[PDB]
Every structure is written in C-alpha cells, then in structure tokens.
Design an enzyme around this catalytic site. Structure first.
Site, PDB file in Angstrom:
ATOM      1  N   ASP A 185     -14.857  -3.989   9.759  1.00 54.99           N
ATOM      2  CA  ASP A 185     -16.315  -3.393   9.034  1.00 54.99           C
ATOM      3  C   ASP A 185     -16.983  -4.517   8.131  1.00 54.99           C
ATOM      4  OD1 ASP A 185     -18.098  -1.186   8.821  1.00 54.99           O
ATOM      5  OD2 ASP A 185     -17.199  -1.110   6.643  1.00 54.99           O
ATOM      6  N   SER A 197     -11.213  10.585  -4.092  1.00 53.28           N
ATOM      7  CA  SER A 197     -10.855  10.486  -2.586  1.00 53.28           C
ATOM      8  C   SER A 197      -9.505  10.322  -2.828  1.00 53.28           C
ATOM      9  CB  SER A 197     -11.563   9.079  -2.144  1.00 53.28           C
ATOM     10  OG  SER A 197     -11.115   7.952  -2.588  1.00 53.28           O
ATOM     11  N   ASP A 236     -12.179   8.049  -7.894  1.00 50.74           N
ATOM     12  CA  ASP A 236     -13.420   8.778  -7.601  1.00 50.74           C
ATOM     13  C   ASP A 236     -13.467  10.071  -6.820  1.00 50.74           C
ATOM     14  OD1 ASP A 236     -12.404   8.150  -5.009  1.00 50.74           O
ATOM     15  OD2 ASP A 236     -13.959   6.917  -4.386  1.00 50.74           O
ATOM     16  N   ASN A 286      -7.357   8.650  -5.891  1.00 58.93           N
ATOM     17  CA  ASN A 286      -8.078   7.510  -6.464  1.00 58.93           C
ATOM     18  C   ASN A 286      -9.149   7.847  -7.530  1.00 58.93           C
ATOM     19  OD1 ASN A 286      -8.522   6.624  -2.863  1.00 58.93           O
ATOM     20  ND2 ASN A 286      -6.972   5.616  -4.365  1.00 58.93           N
ATOM     21  N   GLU A 305       0.923  -1.170  -0.071  1.00 54.00           N
ATOM     22  CA  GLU A 305       0.006   0.050  -0.149  1.00 54.00           C
ATOM     23  C   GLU A 305       0.867   1.196  -0.259  1.00 54.00           C
ATOM     24  OE1 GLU A 305      -3.144   0.398  -0.448  1.00 54.00           O
ATOM     25  OE2 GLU A 305      -4.070  -1.617   0.041  1.00 54.00           O
TER      26      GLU A 305
END
Ligand SMILES: [Cl-]
Ligand SMILES: [Cl-]
Length: 128
Positions: A101, A50, A48, A46, A35
């Site tokens: 989550d 974000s 989108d 990213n 990462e």
C-alpha cells in the site's frame, strides 16, 4: 493456534512472504512475534474503536469487516474472524495487500518499533 517460531517461518515461506516487496522472511516472523506472540487467535482493540486480528494484527478500519468499526473499509474483502484461523492463508494474502500500500512494513507498529533496524534474521536462525 499458537505457532512455533520455525513452524511459522515455514508457513510464511510457503505462502511466498520471503522477500515479498523486498522484506526478508525474518521481518515477517519478527512482526508476528511482536504483533501476536505467534497466536492466530489474538485480538486487540485499538483506541479509535477498530480492532486488530490474528497472527499479523490486521486492522478493521481498513482491511477486514468486523461489523463494529464505523467507516470500516474492508479492502481485503474478508470477515475479520477469518483472520483468526489456524490456516494463515487469508492473513498472508491480506498482508500482501497491506505491505504493497505505500509505507511498506511500517504499517505494522510492532515491526517499526521492535523489528526495524534489528537483526531480524535471528528470527529464522536454526530453522530448516
Ligand atoms: Cl531474514
Ligand atoms: Cl518498502
């Protein structure tokens, strides 16, 4: 801060990631390598809109506030900039929420594509 491999493993173990939701320590170290290349300061935008922040590339759409991601939630209730600290505490606490989550470590695209199903223990081999 660019962490050394064993140095990051030590810090993650101290903060209680080893076997957290059943993920062995090398999963976490492997996720970080792929990462962020173990760089606390890493940022990546990213598609989108974000952005992903820090050692575990935590996303601004759901988890932290960066003030430029429309529809941002901020479920870890933190500025995204606090995820770039040389101290990984905020990143770890937020990763704990993430991994709890529902989809576990599959929330980390690099984990799923480069760690899952591999010999992840190799990432802590040689460390004391
Ligand atoms: Cl491991
Ligand atoms: Cl899981």
């Amino acid at each position: 801060k660019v962490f050394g491999r064993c140095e990051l493993a030590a810090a993650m173990k101290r903060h209680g990631l080893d076997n957290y939701r059943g993920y062995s320590l090398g999963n976490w170290v492997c996720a970080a390598k792929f990462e962020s290349n173990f760089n606390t300061q890493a940022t990546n935008r990213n598609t989108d809109g974000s952005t992903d922040y820090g050692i575990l590339q935590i996303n601004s759409r759901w988890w932290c506030n960066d003030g430029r991601t429309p529809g941002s939630r901020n479920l870890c209730n933190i500025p995204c900039s606090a995820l770039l600290s040389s101290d990984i505490t905020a990143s770890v606490n937020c990763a704990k929420k993430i991994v709890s989550d529902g989809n576990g470590m599959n929330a980390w695209v690099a984990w799923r594509n480069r760690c899952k199903g591999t010999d992840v223990q190799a990432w802590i081999r040689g460390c004391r």
